[PDB]
Design a protein around this ligand. Structure first.
Ligand SMILES: Nc1ncnc2c1ncn2[C@@H]1O[C@H](COP(=O)(O)OP(=O)(O)OP(=O)(O)O)[C@@H](O)[C@H]1O
Ligand SMILES: Nc1ncnc2c1ncn2[C@@H]1O[C@H](COP(=O)(O)OP(=O)(O)OP(=O)(O)O)[C@@H](O)[C@H]1O
Ligand SMILES: [Mg+2]
Ligand SMILES: [Mg+2]
Lengths: 289, 214, 262, 135, 290, 34, 17, 72, 98, 101
């Protein structure tokens, strides 16, 4: 009371996310660990600038697996170049479980919360980022004495009210009722957006890179043949399919598994490719010689 | 125009879920055209959504399929040709015995040219006369009699597809392995029909008596 | 150095084996993992299409699931014990006065080993298959050790009951995979020692053990004769009474010579 | 032209308040552009809300413009559609305005439902149920 | 030592890292930043996994005067060895706009730590050009046919980018853009086409005016530059040959499939044309009862 | 040249259907119905 | 029993130290 | 320190050791210069009692003298 | 023989031009050409029926003051040639550059 | 729009935690169901609001949402054990015109 008293929205930089994933992915299946380095401005805005990993253990993540030597010394490296800030929290990996804090890490978060009470824990799944979507979530403890004092609505004040969930019954209990979740957004400048968007020096010069014509004749041959067979499929569909109740007709006279849609799709697809192939050849012949 | 653009982006997203890695289950039977029952080969049965704009003509009867690893959904399908128990053993192998070992055993020769070869050369011979075709062939007798010899001999003669399976190629080694091996071999046979399926012995596989208390 | 190589080791992760079950497209492969369920996996540019082929043990990753590299074939832990117990060794002569039977044994074994070409001249099938049977203690086993010692051809072995397993489809596995071993290793000689275990007949009106025998027995027949045919893989079968056996294990052309030592 | 989410969010409302209550095609035109062509959700929402301010002077045409936008199933786009209708057609109601909001009241997304209930009350503000049964 | 630098794959992580360190030392107004490059070697592709900054103060009176901390380097390396033990010194990144001849002496210094040939990775922090912001070079010794002894000089290495599976999906999570150099749909490859052609037109213009500068402005003559142009002239395509006539014939074939497929879709759409009109008739009945 | 004249007939059919297809549909949806 | 750890095999058959 | 899995060794099938300029393996791979790129040192395949096999690079402190192709 | 092909933008020579240059009969032009191939100083093939030597590959050699000027003009022609052509390609397809 | 917002919606729909096939052994009148999961064992587990134990019966296959095994729907299937025996033996039925004489 007297502040906003809500968990920071963690803005993970362009560098950081990738670094945590590379760090975690190599160690799969074993659990990984490390610190987030960042800076704390508004009552709920922590921008996480960089990360560094705390070396491996033979018992995986523990409070014990923190080693003050590695942490401070690696900090002193950054100190000399002036890129250190302050520890805003830590990350660790559960690739064998979904996003939620295991029994051990809650007590680890307790110690971290003692030191700095904005300390977050971010669970990374390097094993569900083989999707097009990266699975990542942020948690911060709400104390047990704090639940007794019923201060939990204090932490959801002045938010959009949008929170994240992960699987039901055991995962979700720990989630909402013992720690607090806030979404994660991604921070970038226009200098970094250009760095990612760029590709080769012959990727903006890859439209002159025609292909072998044996391959393009393969393409011409395959399309025409296949469409004869889906056309045959299309003939049977429109013989009947003229009584009442559309869905019934579509079930009876194959109208589901729609050949009408499939046939048009293939034709369009091959049609667009062949206008550019013709355009490529007409350019390269006349332009070079 | 903008929607056509985000249609491309959405279609691109859905290819990512069609791609590797994938675990392989087995499709049992539908309960819908967008929800089905599959048995994974992890020894777990799932009821899973089905992706639209897959073809379902080969799906709805049992067939190998791709499911996604972590979420366990029907996201793509496989053709029945691939994911065989064992590939054809009559085009990538060739019988090693011909009818020059066969002198005698003529009594069986009149019965096997009816049974095996006539539906291969033309199945419709039976159908037009109005005789319905005979089913499988059991050869019995002491194995020193040349029962298999005869199989090799006419296999080399007819030169149709042939499959070499055995019960130690159907046998359980983990949960749900054995039944899967059974389904595959007929699937392959029909695809490149006509075909001969040879199981050298079914002595172990079948037994007149059973305990079934264990 | 001794501890710095361990650092390099600890930071390496493991790999999971499979084998190429079936080509799916170009870049997609069906593998059957040794976890057991089949997966679809990718390729690095480290492998090629023409270095992959069916039945090749290939490694996979455990978080990417891509073939990085080709591996040689798996080999059972059991069968190295059998290739490293021949002790009890003795010269060509392992008995005296029964030399006539020693000479007879090498006719089946040793002769087609050295020259298949003399069995070409005749036009017979290269000899194979041996049953040894007789009264007990008569050097039938000591002769087995002697023909592995004297020639020095690749030998395995099998005690009648160390190939028997609790898991089923596992006691089939060894002996199927033991014949495989026999086809990459030169002129192999398979000594079955004192087999009466799976010698049993059809029974299965008794306990479940009699169908366990049955499962393992069917496995042998398909190997002995079929599209799988031998020629430089020989069977020496040692038993202490031969009328225990099932008659399909008395079958000639799998057992072509039946040498008795009295 | 700022690529920040923040400056584009306000960018919409500078058009709205600069050209508030003016029958200008350009003022309206710009807002339509932002809504469809921008790939940040909060910025899509802000473009829709702004519409009702420019077209206070004439709100007859408004429900038809956002009819298109309600078809789109993005939560934020539908959410800002609700508000644009509340803003433009407040006071004495408009039948078209009522209609578009009804599916948005029953939406499966809470953010569109919360927006819609409020927007309706502006259109039907202090209207007796004996003078209209729909109230 | 050796040349094994034929390809250099560079992780996107490293590029992003380089700009971050450059700003957090705030080296501007022609100040430089040097950090170590960690990663694999003894492979024809050189893998750039990671970088870390080294404290390095670069003078403004001269380019021959600099401070670099040698003791710092080992400490950074042993720590990162604990993280992953496949990382060794493979070079150092320079972050200048372009190349210097005082980088040659620095290159020699890093040769001590390496067991490879140091990679100079000029990471541009100015994001110049629509293509890569990386040129790569390695310092190599040569003699040359001019009469020049024991030269040390930088030979350009073609630059490429690879990323790991985890690394790549992070980019996709961060970004959602659709990329002016992309070869996607019909309109997108149309834009790539005209963009690619004008890309070549720009580079060829430079050579023409570069040739003038040799023979009137006395820029140096080098046989590597002249030899490459020779190759262009020698392998240049020719038309009116029997190759050209087969192209045209291949060209009708592609125009043939297009014409068939154009007709195919007219059938499908004309089917829809009818069906809207049947639905109208039914809805008229409905409207009359209504 | 021959193929192009054929493609131009195909393109003519593509214009002709697109315009007329929705036009009876728009009047009929205007008019009241159940 | 190893004289101065122990080897257990669980009922889940799985051996640990 | 505890706990760890207890297993047996399928086989040691070693790969050639790491001193080379082109690969350091016994099984030929596509492409050229390699030493740590996909190349690995000696190999041990071990079979668990959780019932799989894994191809691991064997620890460089444990010898092939401490490894038998059945060793526990 | 190597000189005449490289300096020319044509890469086909009637034996008449070679015979008058090297003061050889047609018999020896055919050997000369054949030797160039064996040594690898030129590569190509021969039409003794068209009576051309069609050379298809010229060895790179030292490039002197005179040649650079020849090399240069060839590059100006192609550079202008793309530029005029790219205008048509800007003009055609105006509607879509998206 | 209907098309592109159906794809975007299917991406969510396809993501599951796993959803099983169970079969009801028997109910208990605590408002719970004893369900034997077909590969696995038995677990008494509660039911949804769209079903209750009177909509459920022995030997009827259900759907489970498998993070607690919370009953989702009845299945569209039901097993019968008498057909198992009859089929596996495999005998047809007849009329008296297939016996006549
Ligand atoms: N009629 C014959 N002409 C020549 N050789 C024969 C004849 N009959 C059998 N043989 C030979 O006897 C051997 C056994 O025949 P076959 O391979 O057919 O196996 P089988 O009787 O089914 O045994 P099992 O099924 O137990 O494996 C073969 O080597 C075969 O060539
Ligand atoms: N003829 C022999 N002369 C010398 N020693 C022999 C002779 N035969 C056997 N022995 C001795 O007897 C021991 C055991 O006999 P072995 O195991 O070789 O025979 P076996 O005939 O198969 O009977 P079993 O298999 O029941 O042991 C040998 O290790 C050896 O010391
Ligand atoms: Mg047989
Ligand atoms: Mg013995």
């Amino acid at each position: 009371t007297g502040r906003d008293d809500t968990k920071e929205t963690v803005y993970i930089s362009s560098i950081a996310l990738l670094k945590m994933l590379k760090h975690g992915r190599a160690g799969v299946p074993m659990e990984v660990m490390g610190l987030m380095l960042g800076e704390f401005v508004d009552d709920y805005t922590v921008n996480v600038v960089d990360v560094f990993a705390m070396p491996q253990s033979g018992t995986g993540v523990s409070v014990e697996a923190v080693d003050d030597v590695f942490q401070a010394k690696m900090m002193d490296m950054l100190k000399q170049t002036g890129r250190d800030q302050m520890v805003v929290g830590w990350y660790h990996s559960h690739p064998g479980f979904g996003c939620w804090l295991s029994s051990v890490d809650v007590n680890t978060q307790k110690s971290f919360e003692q030191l700095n009470s904005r300390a977050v824990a971010v669970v990374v799944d390097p094993i569900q980022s083989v999707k097009g979507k990266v699975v990542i979530d942020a948690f911060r403890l709400i104390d047990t004495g704090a639940l007794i004092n019923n201060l939990e609505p204090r932490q959801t004040t002045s938010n959009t009210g949008l929170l994240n969930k992960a699987n039901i019954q055991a995962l979700i209990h720990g989630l909402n009722r013992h720690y607090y979740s806030l979404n994660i957004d991604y921070h970038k400048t226009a200098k970094e957006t250009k760095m990612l968007m760029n590709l080769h020096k012959e990727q903006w010069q890859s439209g002159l890179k025609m292909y072998d014509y044996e391959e393009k004749e393969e393409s011409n041959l395959a399309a025409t043949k296949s469409m004869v067979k889906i056309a045959e499929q299309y003939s049977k569909r429109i013989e009947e399919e003229k009584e009442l109740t559309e869905e019934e007709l579509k079930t009876r006279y194959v109208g589901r598994q729609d050949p009408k849609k499939h046939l048009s799709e293939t034709a369009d697809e091959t049609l667009e490719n062949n206008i550019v192939s013709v355009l490529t050849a007409g350019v390269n012949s006349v332009a070079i010689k | 125009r903008h929607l056509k653009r985000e249609l491309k982006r959405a279609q691109e997203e859905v290819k990512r879920i069609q791609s590797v890695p994938l675990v392989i289950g087995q499709f049992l039977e539908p309960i819908d055209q967008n929800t089905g029952i599959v048995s994974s080969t992890t020894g777990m049965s799932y009821v899973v959504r089905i992706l639209s704009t897959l073809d379902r003509e080969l799906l709805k009867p049992s067939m190998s399929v791709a499911l996604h690893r972590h979420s366990n959904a029907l996201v793509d399908i496989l053709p029945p040709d691939s994911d065989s128990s064992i590939s054809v053993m009559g085009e990538n192998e060739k019988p090693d015995v011909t009818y020059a070992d066969v002198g005698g055993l003529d009594m069986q020769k009149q019965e096997i040219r009816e049974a095996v070869e006539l539906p291969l050369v033309q199945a419709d011979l039976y159908e037009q006369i109005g005789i319905d075709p005979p089913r499988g062939v059991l050869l019995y007798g002491p194995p020193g009699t040349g029962k298999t010899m005869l199989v090799k001999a006419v296999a080399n003669s007819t030169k149709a597809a042939f499959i070499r399976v055995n019960g130690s190629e159907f046998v359980h080694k983990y949960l749900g392995e054995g039944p899967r091996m059974v389904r595959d071999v007929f699937r392959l046979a029909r695809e490149n029909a006509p075909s001969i399926i040879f199981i050298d012995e079914v002595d172990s596989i079948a037994t007149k008596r059973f305990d079934a208390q264990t | 150095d001794k501890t710095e190589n361990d650092i390099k080791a600890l930071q390496s992760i493991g790999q999971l084996i499979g084998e190429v079950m079936k080509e799916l497209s170009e870049e997609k492969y069906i593998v059957k993992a040794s976890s057991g369920p089949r997966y679809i996996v990718g390729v690095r540019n480290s492998v090629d299409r023409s270095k992959l082929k069916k039945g090749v043990r290939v490694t996979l990753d455990i978080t990417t699931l891509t073939i990085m590299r080709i591996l040689p074939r798996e080999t059972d832990p059991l069968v190295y014990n059998m290739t490293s117990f021949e002790q009890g060794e003795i010269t060509f002569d392992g008995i005296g006065g029964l030399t006539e039977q020693i000479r007879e044994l090498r006719e089946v074994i040793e002769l087609p080993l050295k020259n298949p070409e003399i069995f070409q001249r005749v036009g017979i099938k290269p000899p194979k298959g041996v049953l040894l049977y007789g009264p007990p203690g008569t050097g039938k086993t000591l002769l087995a050790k002697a023909v592995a010692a004297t020639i020095g051809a690749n030998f395995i072995f099998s005690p009648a009951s160390g190939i028997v397993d609790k898991y089923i489809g596992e006691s089939a596995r060894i002996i199927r995979e033991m014949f495989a071993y026999a086809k990459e290793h030169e002129p192999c000689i398979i000594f079955m020692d004192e087999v009466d275990a799976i010698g049993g007949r059809r029974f299965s009106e008794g306990t479940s053990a009699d169908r366990e025998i049955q499962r393992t027995l069917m496995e042998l027949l398909t190997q002995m004769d079929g599209f799988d045919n031998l020629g430089q893989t020989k069977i020496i079968m040692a038993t202490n009474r031969p009328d225990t056996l099932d008659p399909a294990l008395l079958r000639p052309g799998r057992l072509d010579r039946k040498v008795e030592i009295p | 032209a700022s690529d920040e989410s923040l400056l584009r969010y306000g960018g919409a409302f500078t058009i709205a308040l600069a050209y508030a209550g003016t029958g200008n095609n350009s003022a309206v035109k710009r807002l339509l552009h932002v809504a469809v062509s921008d790939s940040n959700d909060d910025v899509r929402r802000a473009a829709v809300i702004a519409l009702g301010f420019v077209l206070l002077r004439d709100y007859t045409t408004v429900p038809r413009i956002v009819q298109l936008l309600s078809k789109s199933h993005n939560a934020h786009v539908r959410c800002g559609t609700a508000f644009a209708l509340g803003i433009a057609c407040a006071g004495k109601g408009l039948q078209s305005a009522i209609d578009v909001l009804d599916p948005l009241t029953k939406d499966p997304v809470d953010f569109v439902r919360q927006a819609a209930m409020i927007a309706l009350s502006m259109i039907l503000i202090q209207q007796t149920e004996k003078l209209n049964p729909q109230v | 030592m050796s040349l094994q630098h034929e390809k250099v794959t560079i992780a996107p992580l490293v590029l992003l890292s380089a700009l971050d360190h450059y700003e957090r030392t705030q080296t501007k107004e022609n100040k430089r930043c040097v950090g170590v490059i960690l990663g694999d070697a003894n492979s024809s592709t050189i893998r750039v996994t990671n970088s870390f900054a080294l404290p390095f103060e670069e003078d403004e009176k001269n380019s021959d005067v600099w401070f670099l901390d040698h003791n710092y380097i080992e400490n950074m390396n042993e720590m990162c060895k604990k993280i992953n033990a496949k990382e060794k010194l493979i070079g150092w990144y320079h972050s200048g706009p372009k190349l210097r001849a005082s980088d040659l002496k620095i290159n020699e210094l890093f040769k001590k730590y390496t067991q490879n040939n140091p990679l100079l990775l000029i990471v541009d922090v100015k994001q110049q050009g629509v293509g890569l912001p990386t040129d790569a070079y390695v310092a190599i010794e040569q003699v040359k046919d001019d009469g020049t002894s024991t030269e040390k000089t930088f030979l350009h290495l073609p630059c490429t980018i690879e990323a790991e599976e985890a690394e790549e999906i992070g980019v996709e999570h961060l970004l959602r853009d659709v990329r002016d150099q992309a070869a996607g749909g019909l309109s997108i490859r149309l834009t790539n086409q005209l963009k690619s052609l004008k890309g070549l037109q720009s580079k060829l213009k430079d050579v023409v005016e570069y040739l003038d500068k040799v023979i009137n402005k006395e820029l140096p003559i080098n046989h590597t530059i002249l030899g490459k142009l020779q190759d262009v002239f020698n392998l240049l395509p020719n038309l009116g040959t029997p190759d050209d006539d087969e192209i045209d014939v291949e060209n009708h074939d592609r125009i043939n499939i297009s014409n068939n497929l154009q007709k195919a879709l007219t059938v499908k759409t004309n089917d829809e044309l009818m069906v809207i009109y049947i639905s109208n008739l039914v809805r008229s009945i409905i409207a009359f009862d209504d | 040249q021959v193929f192009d004249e054929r493609i131009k007939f195909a393109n003519q059919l593509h214009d002709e259907y697109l315009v007329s297809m929705r036009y009876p549909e728009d009047k009929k949806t205007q008019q009241n119905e159940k | 029993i190893i004289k101065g750890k122990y080897v257990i095999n669980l009922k889940q058959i799985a051996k640990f130290v | 320190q505890l706990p760890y899995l207890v297993a047996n060794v399928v086989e040691v099938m070693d790969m050639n050791e790491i001193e080379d300029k082109e690969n350091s393996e016994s099984t030929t791979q596509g492409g050229n210069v390699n030493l740590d790129n996909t190349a690995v040192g000696k190999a041990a395949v071990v079979k668990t009692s959780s019932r799989q096999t894994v191809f691991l690079p064997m620890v460089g402190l444990v010898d092939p003298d401490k490894l038998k192709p059945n060793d526990l | 023989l190597i000189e005449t092909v490289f300096v020319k933008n044509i890469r086909m020579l009637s034996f008449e031009d070679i015979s008058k240059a090297t003061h050889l009969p047609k018999d020896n032009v055919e050997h000369l050409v054949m030797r160039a191939i064996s040594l690898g100083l030129l590569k190509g093939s021969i039409d003794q029926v068209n009576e051309l030597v069609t050379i298809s590959w010229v060895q790179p050699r030292i490039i002197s003051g005179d040649q650079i000027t020849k090399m240069k003009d060839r590059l100006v022609e192609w550079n202008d040639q793309v530029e005029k052509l790219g205008k048509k390609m800007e003009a055609r397809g105006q509607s879509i550059w998206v | 729009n209907d098309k592109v917002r159906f794809i975007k919606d299917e991406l969510r729909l396809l993501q599951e935690p796993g959803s099983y096939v169970g079969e009801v052994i028997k109910i208990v009148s605590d408002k719970k169901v004893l369900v034997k999961v077909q590969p696995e064992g038995k677990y008494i587990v509660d039911v949804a609001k769209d079903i209750n134990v009177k909509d459920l019966k022995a030997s009827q296959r259900v759907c489970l949402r498998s993070d607690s095994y919370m009953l989702h729907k009845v299945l569209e299937n039901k097993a019968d054990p008498l057909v198992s025996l009859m089929m596996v033996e495999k005998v047809p039925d007849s009329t008296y015109d297939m016996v006549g004489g």
